[PDB]
Amino acid sequence: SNAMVQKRVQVSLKNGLQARPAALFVQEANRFHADIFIEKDGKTVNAKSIMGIMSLAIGTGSMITITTEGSDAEEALEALAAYVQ
C-alpha cells in the first residue's frame, strides 16, 4: 500500500505543456517536497524533469495523469492540476 494521490486532468494550455509553460511547470514541481509524476498515453515521467516532460509532447487538450506521493503530495497535485487546467 501507498499514500499516493492522482488525478486525470485536461490540459487546456494553448502551448500545451511545452515551451515556457513547460519550464515554469517544472520549476513549480521542483518547489514541492513530494515526488511527482506525469503520465500521458501510457508513458510516465518525473514532473521535475524538463526533458521528461518535453518527451511526452503534451499538446492542448491532452489528458494527463498527475501522481504525487510525499509530505505535500495533495498540495503539489492540486497546484499542478490548477496550473494546466
Please give the C-alpha separations between residue 21 and each of 3, 13, 37, 69, 72, in angstroms, as whole numbers. Answer: 28, 8, 17, 23, 22
Cell of 49: 524533469
Contacts of 30 by beta carbon, 8 Å cutoff, 6+ apart: 48
Q: Residue 63's beta-bridge partner residues? A: 10
What technique was this entry resolved by? X-ray
Resolution of the experimental structure, in angstroms: 1.1
> What dihedral do alpha carbons 77, 78, 82, 85 form, nearest 10°?
60
62 SS3 class: coil
Q: Residue 46's beta-bridge partner residues? A: 37
Crossing angle of helices 19-31 and 73-84, in 10° steps, is: 170
DSSP 8-state secondary structure symbol assigned to residue 61: T
CATH number of the domain where residue 11 is located: 3.30.1340.10
Domain count, the chain: 1
Which residue range(s) make up the domain with 54? 1-85
Which helix (DSSP H) or strand (DSSP E) does residue 40 occupy? strand 35-40
Cell of 43: 508513458
